[PDB]
Amino acid sequence: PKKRQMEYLTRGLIAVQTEQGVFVSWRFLGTDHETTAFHLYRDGKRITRDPIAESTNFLDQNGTADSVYQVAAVNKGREEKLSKKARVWQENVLEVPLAKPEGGVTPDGKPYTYSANDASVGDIDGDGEYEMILKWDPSNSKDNAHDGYTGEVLIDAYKLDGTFLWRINLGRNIRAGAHYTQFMVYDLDGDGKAEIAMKTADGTTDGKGHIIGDEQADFRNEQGRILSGPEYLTVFKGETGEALTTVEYEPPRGKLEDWGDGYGNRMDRFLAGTAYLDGERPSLVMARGYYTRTVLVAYDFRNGRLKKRWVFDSNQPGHEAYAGQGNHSLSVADVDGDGKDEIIYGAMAVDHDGTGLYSTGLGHGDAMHVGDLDPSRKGLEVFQVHEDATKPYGLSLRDAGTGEILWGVHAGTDVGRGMAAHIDPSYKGSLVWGIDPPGNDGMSYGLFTSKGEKISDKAPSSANFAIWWDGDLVRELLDHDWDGTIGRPKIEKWDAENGCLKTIFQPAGVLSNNGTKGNPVLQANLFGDWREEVIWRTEDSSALRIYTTTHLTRHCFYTLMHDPVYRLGIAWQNTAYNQPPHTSFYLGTGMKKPPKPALYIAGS
Ligand SMILES: [Ca+2]
Ligand SMILES: [Ca+2]
Ligand SMILES: [Ca+2]
Ligand SMILES: [Ca+2]
Ligand SMILES: [Ca+2]
Ligand SMILES: [Ca+2]
Ligand SMILES: [Ca+2]
Ligand SMILES: [Ca+2]
Ligand SMILES: [Ca+2]
């Protein structure tokens, strides 16, 4: 296999106080050998005798609040350089204080405030530790079709120690809302440091205070929309937030009505992804449209410049059937076995070279999941739900590479949420299900194996994120309890024996994001072992709280950020209606040994 550019990562050693001792976990790196084992040191002294070789975690019954840990890789009996010293966290929470921006007033005299919203991660300085890239959302942010002015969108960078690095202000000409700004954080050129790409406009102010274009320009109409004036695409330096290059946004508006309405409702439907279109280095993919005209534009970033790679446009001859298929998210994976990434754009797919891969014709939906959902069947599968009541299926399971529909279930109505996850150890692969979102009819559309066997008419009442949280191979479920105004985050576990969800984590003082959608700020394997961390905002957005597991595992996996599908999932997590990340391999009961990551480290 081709070796993919990936991020340098430190051991990511953490230590957390529990009632039974100090829980320690660290990364198994893509550069480690399958036979690599580990020694642990507490207060300078080795506390392991036999190197730890079956996991990258440890419960130290002799650890105290004052203990300091280091880990060393061991290969062929030879021990390597010890990690940085890790101190013991008092709780399984790392709190990152925020510089909460002050609210304001829109032109119509209506006040707004800010809350901490979607995030992404990138290593902006190349030291092997992630920084947080955080989007602030004003309290007046808008669904496209709802009129009204919005507060300016702000994007911040923070170090995990709470250091505020910079703020980008997108300015008055970028409307706030789920479907507008899609911020892509990645080391696009391979120097070892992440940059940030997003759509910008006249009046966007970068991290060093430099304004893009005309500072005086105001393209907001009486309804608070921006439907005129230049549109730009900017790559910002990770370290400083400074604009590196700005180009014209593609595709341009053209005649408004050609998108299907004159209000920009369909036109201003943006998505973004990072994809290894050559199977070796990342490319940037900025997308516009899914209900009607659908356009994906690929770029390569090198030596301070964006260069257009290709354009997929449903208006192109032979591509008409590709319109109306995109979801409020996209997925990225090598689905056809050529080593190169394809874009799974909801109910259709675009090949690595920008040609049409397939269109299912099943139409736009609000959730999708690409992974090895049926490990008995060669290749990846796509499970998704569908919104159009007139279409054949409310939920569909297909071959990811050919688009062949393996099975589907008719609904004759919008199926607004869906999940695919290994929640039942007695089925090798994912169960899949569809349910109504909160504040709707509370309907279930069934729980099925990925082969289409109906387990029950009543599906798990959570269909949002799935998260590896505890020690076992089953995936847990992340959602919230929505009360009509706010959501209280939770992680739940499926009880397959009696067909119910049990709450296993529900932290106080934090809120979910994006209304009924109930998103975390971010879910990602940020540090420690292969289990995933989760970030939620405090109620007042004075801080982010990053939660990490303290459940001991007997299982060992390479860090998920070194997985070619999972890492790209983190990059698109913020995109429109946030979707959860998946592994390129089947992780679950009865799994075969995963292949070691085929990679090289950017920046040597
Ligand atoms: Ca860093
Ligand atoms: Ca870079
Ligand atoms: Ca491929
Ligand atoms: Ca291909
Ligand atoms: Ca939708
Ligand atoms: Ca499969
Ligand atoms: Ca589990
Ligand atoms: Ca972890
Ligand atoms: Ca989002």
Is residue 425 reached through a cis peptide bond, with omega within 30 degrees of 0 on the bond before it? Answer: no
What DSSP letter does each residue of 15-60 carry, written as one string? EEEETTEEEEE----TTS-TT-EEEEEETTEE--SSPB-S-SEEEE
Do residues 408 and 393 lie in contact, with contact meaning Cβ atoms separated by under 8 Å?
yes
- DSSP annotation of 13 reads -
Give the contacts of 2 (CB within 8 A, at least 6 positions apart).
279, 280, 339, 598
Is 336 known as a binding-site position?
yes
Most distant CA pair in the chain, distance: 71
Those residues whose beta carbon sits under 5 angstroms from the ion ligand 4 are 336, 338, 351-352
Give the contacts of 361 (CB within 8 A, at least 6 positions apart).
321, 325, 347
Measured distance CA(50)–CA(45) in Å, rounded: 14
In this structure, the number of other CB atoms found within 10 A of the CB of residue 289 comes to: 24
- Among all bound ligands, the one having the nearest atom to the CA of 12 is 8
Question: Last residue of some domain: 35, 64, 91?
Answer: 91
CATH number at residue 24: 2.60.40.10
For residue 530, the one-letter residue type is W
**How far does residue 525's CA lie from ligand 7's centre (Å)?**
14
Measured distance CA(333)–CA(344) in Å, rounded: 8
Domains in the chain: how many in total?
2
Task: Specify the resolution in Å.
Answer: 1.6
Do residues 279 and 4 lie in contact, with contact meaning Cβ atoms separated by under 8 Å?
yes
Find, among 142, 368, 347, 152, the residue nearest to 264 by Cα.
142
**How far does residue 408's CA lie from ligand 3's centre (Å)?**
25
Is 540 known as a binding-site position?
no
Measured distance CA(389)–CA(594) in Å, rounded: 39
Do residues 31 and 600 lie in contact, with contact meaning Cβ atoms separated by under 8 Å?
no
Give the method of determination. X-ray
**How far does residue 408's CA lie from ligand 1's centre (Å)?**
44
Give the contacts of 255 (CB within 8 A, at least 6 positions apart).
none
* Token pair recorded at residue 233: 């695409």
Question: Last residue of some domain: 91, 124, 157?
Answer: 91
Whether residues 48 and 176 share a domain: the answer is no
- Among all bound ligands, the one having the nearest atom to the CA of 352 is 4
For residue 532, the one-letter residue type is E
Whether residues 45 and 179 share a domain: the answer is no
* Token pair recorded at residue 319: 């591509």
How many Å separate Cα 373 from the centre of its chain?
Answer: 18
Is 454 known as a binding-site position?
no
Is 7 known as a binding-site position?
no
Q: Which residue has the tokens 């695919």?
A: 420
Question: Phi, psi at residue 232, to the nearest 5°?
Answer: -125, 165
- Among all bound ligands, the one having the nearest atom to the CA of 333 is 3
Whether residues 183 and 51 share a domain: the answer is no
At 500, is the secondary structure helix, strand, or coil?
A: strand
Which residues face 58 on adjacent strands? 24
Whether residues 86 and 102 share a domain: the answer is no
Question: Last residue of some domain: 63, 91, 119?
Answer: 91
Find, among 584, 534, 581, the residue nearest to 557 by Cα.
584
The C-alpha torsion from 208 through 520 and 532 to 575, rounded to 10°, is -60
- DSSP annotation of 571 reads H
Do residues 159 and 239 lie in contact, with contact meaning Cβ atoms separated by under 8 Å?
no
Is 383 known as a binding-site position?
no
**How far does residue 325's CA lie from ligand 5's centre (Å)?**
11
Give the contacts of 97 (CB within 8 A, at least 6 positions apart).
162, 542, 543
Whether residues 216 and 292 share a domain: the answer is yes
Whether residues 75 and 99 share a domain: the answer is no
What DSSP letter does each residue of 376-390 carry, written as one string? TSSS-EEEEE---TT
**How far does residue 480's CA lie from ligand 6's centre (Å)?**
30
- DSSP annotation of 105 reads E
> Residue 318: how many CA atoms within 13 Å on its side-chain side?
7
Is 81 known as a binding-site position?
no
Whether residues 87 and 97 share a domain: the answer is no
In this structure, the number of other CB atoms found within 10 A of the CB of residue 242 comes to: 15
- Among all bound ligands, the one having the nearest atom to the CA of 494 is 7
* Token pair recorded at residue 584: 């390129």
First to last CA, the chain: 20
**How far does residue 429's CA lie from ligand 6's centre (Å)?**
8
Domain that holds residue 135: 92-604
Do residues 524 and 581 lie in contact, with contact meaning Cβ atoms separated by under 8 Å?
yes
Give the contacts of 232 (CB within 8 A, at least 6 positions apart).
199, 200, 201, 204, 212, 213, 246, 247, 248, 249
In this structure, the number of other CB atoms found within 10 A of the CB of residue 77 comes to: 7
User: What pairing do the DSSP bridges indicate for beta strands 78-79 and 93-97?
Assistant: unpaired
- Among all bound ligands, the one having the nearest atom to the CA of 584 is 6
Whether residues 85 and 96 share a domain: the answer is no
Measured distance CA(56)–CA(300) in Å, rounded: 36
